[PDB]
């Protein structure tokens, strides 16, 4: 429902969910990866844009929460019946469907099920536990037809599926298949995203047929009738096991199949891309939503592989965007809480910036004549130097020129920044 939100009372449900997620930090001191999908939905809420500031504060607590964890459905199913599968792939459908009966009979073997005259679940027996060879081809069609609708769903997406690489407990009564190990097959992240999108097909098609079915009965709805992006990853897993189901058998046959944590730090680099968009703002209402993302940055970094150190260099870049202001004010204070939090990014584990200190010293010459934001940036950078104490000297000699400016004379506190 949180991902369904991004009326406003569902964003308030995100606020109660945010403080309760901080109570989950107390339990902490998977489903959570789905909640990371819902954090990307929060970044979509940063894309969405006064009540917005409240729902942004609860979203800032949700950022504190996921950092502590790190320590109208409208289906549009693709065309299937339009598509025509080439005849040579149906011989492959004989293999994946024969495997479907081998695994569906073997699931029955996992609980000691056997062949019977009746569907008597007390008798520990089922009628269909007879060999896949014995099936009439129309009985094989009850297994094959969803598979054929899936291969047509891929060919409507025009995904390639083609020959390449070579293919590959006391015993139970009834037929006894020993299926090839699809579970040991591991899809590449390209093909894993392909499992994500075939699961998205199962979701939009079976979800649209489910919606029109319950409207055909005059009835209501089902829990899964929410958009596939909105789903928790555990709800996506059920369709995904059926997608990899496929795709894993496609990898085991060695067929080429194509469309034809660290990821949170990569999302932080997407937030740095939002900072590039904020430079586009700096060229001149969405930049205030970027300030919402700044509150989210101070809070998520207050809890704070190499992509993260790249995002530290991005801290130095958006610090240059502050340096444009050096020479709203509360968004800058959000950037200051984001600066101490950037010291915390220094705590997670170029020379150009020292040169900007030389500009900081010449600006100090203006002070000898007697705006101050380049001094305040220099004070937070001094706190970053205290972070260096936790762990370019000629620019320090330029700062010795600024010591000569100390000799030239509120200001003693800027001497304390030094």
- β-pairing verdict for 160-162 and 256-258: antiparallel
Residues across the chain: 418
Phi, psi at residue 161, to the nearest 5°? -145, 105
Q: Report DSSP letters for 143-205, one per residue.
A: HHHHHHHHHHHHHHTT-EEE--S----PPPSS-------GGG----HHHHHHHHHHHHHHHHH
The residue whose two tokens read 């202001």 is: 325
Contacts of 221 (CB under 8 A, 6+ apart): 211, 214
Dihedral angle computed from the Cα positions of residues 137, 140, 144 and 146, in that order, rounded to the nearest 10 degrees: 120
- Give the residues across from 161 on adjacent strands: 257
- H or E element that contains 257: strand 256-258
Distance between CA 46 and CA 238 in Å, rounded? 30
Tell which residue, 203, 80, 59, has the closest CA to residue 148: 80
The interaxial angle of helices 31-48 and 233-252, nearest 10 deg, is 110
Burial of 222 (C-beta count, 10 Å sphere; 0-12/13-18/19+): middle
User: At what resolution in Å was this solved?
Assistant: 5.7
Distance between CA 210 and CA 112 in Å, rounded? 33
- H or E element that contains 402: helix 395-408
105 contacts 174 by C-beta, under 8 angstroms: yes
The Cβ-side half-sphere exposure at 60, using a 13 Å CA radius, reads 21
Helix (H, G, I), strand (E, B) or coil at 256: strand
Distance between CA 166 and CA 41 in Å, rounded? 42
The residue whose two tokens read 């495997």 is: 99
Distance between CA 220 and CA 263 in Å, rounded? 38
317 contacts 275 by C-beta, under 8 angstroms: yes
- Give the residues across from 256 on adjacent strands: 162
Alpha carbon of 133 to those of 140, 146, 180: distances in Å? 9, 20, 18
137 contacts 92 by C-beta, under 8 angstroms: no
Question: What was the structure determination method?
Answer: cryo-EM
Distance between CA 206 and CA 202 in Å, rounded? 6
The residue whose two tokens read 């025509």 is: 84
- H or E element that contains 258: strand 256-258
Distance between CA 138 and CA 120 in Å, rounded? 24
196 contacts 246 by C-beta, under 8 angstroms: no
């Amino acid at each position: 429902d949180v991902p369904i939100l991004n009326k406003m009372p569902l964003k308030l449900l995100t606020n109660h969910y945010e403080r309760c997620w901080k109570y989950y930090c107390l339990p902490t001191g998977t489903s959570e990866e789905e909640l990371h999908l819902t954090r990307k939905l929060f970044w979509g809420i940063f894309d969405s844009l006064y009540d917005q500031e409240l729902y942004r504060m609860a979203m800032p607590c949700l950022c504190a929460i996921a950092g502590a964890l790190p320590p109208n459905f409208d289906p549009r199913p693709v065309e299937t019946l339009n598509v025509i599968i080439p005849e040579k792939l149906d011989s492959f459908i004989n293999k994946f469907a024969e495997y479907t009966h081998e695994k569906w009979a073997f699931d029955k073997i996992q609980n000691n099920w056997s062949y019977g005259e009746n569907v008597d679940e007390e008798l520990k027996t089922h009628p269909m536990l007879r060999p896949y060879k014995t099936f009439s081809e129309k009985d094989k069609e009850i297994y094959r037809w969803p598979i054929k609708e899936s291969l047509k769903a891929m060919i409507a997406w025009e995904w390639t599926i083609e020959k390449a690489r070579e293919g590959e407990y006391d015993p139970r009564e009834g037929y006894n298949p020993q299926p090839p190990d699809l579970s040991g097959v591991t899809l590449s992240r390209e093909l894993q995203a392909m499992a994500e999108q075939l699961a998205e097909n199962y979701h939009n098609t079976w979800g649209r047929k489910k919606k029109q079915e319950l409207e055909a009965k005059g009835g209501g709805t089902h829990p899964l009738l929410v958009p596939y992006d909105t789903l928790t990853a555990k709800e996506k897993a059920r369709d995904r096991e059926k997608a990899q189901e496929l795709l894993k058998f496609l990898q085991m046959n060695g067929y080429a199949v194509t469309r034809g944590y660290f990821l949170s730090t990569p999302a932080k680099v997407l937030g740095s891309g939002g900072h590039a968009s904020n430079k586009e703002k700096e060229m001149i209402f969405c930049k205030l939503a970027a300030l919402v993302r700044h509150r989210v940055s101070l809070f998520g970094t207050d809890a704070p592989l190499h992509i993260l150190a790249r995002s530290l260099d991005a801290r130095t870049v958006m610090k240059s965007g502050p340096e444009i202001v050096k020479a709203f004010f509360e968004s800058a204070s959000e950037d200051i809480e984001k600066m101490v939090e950037n010291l915390r990014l220094g705590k997670v584990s170029t020379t150009v910036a020292l040169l900007p200190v030389l500009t900081t010293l010449f600006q100090h010459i203006a002070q000898h004549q007697f705006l101050d934001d380049v001094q305040v940036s220099c004070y937070r950078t001094l706190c970053s130097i205290y972070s260096l104490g936790t762990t370019v000297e000629k620019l320090r000699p330029a700062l010795g020129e600024c010591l000569a400016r100390l000799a030239a004379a509120a200001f003693l506190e800027p001497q304390l920044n030094e």
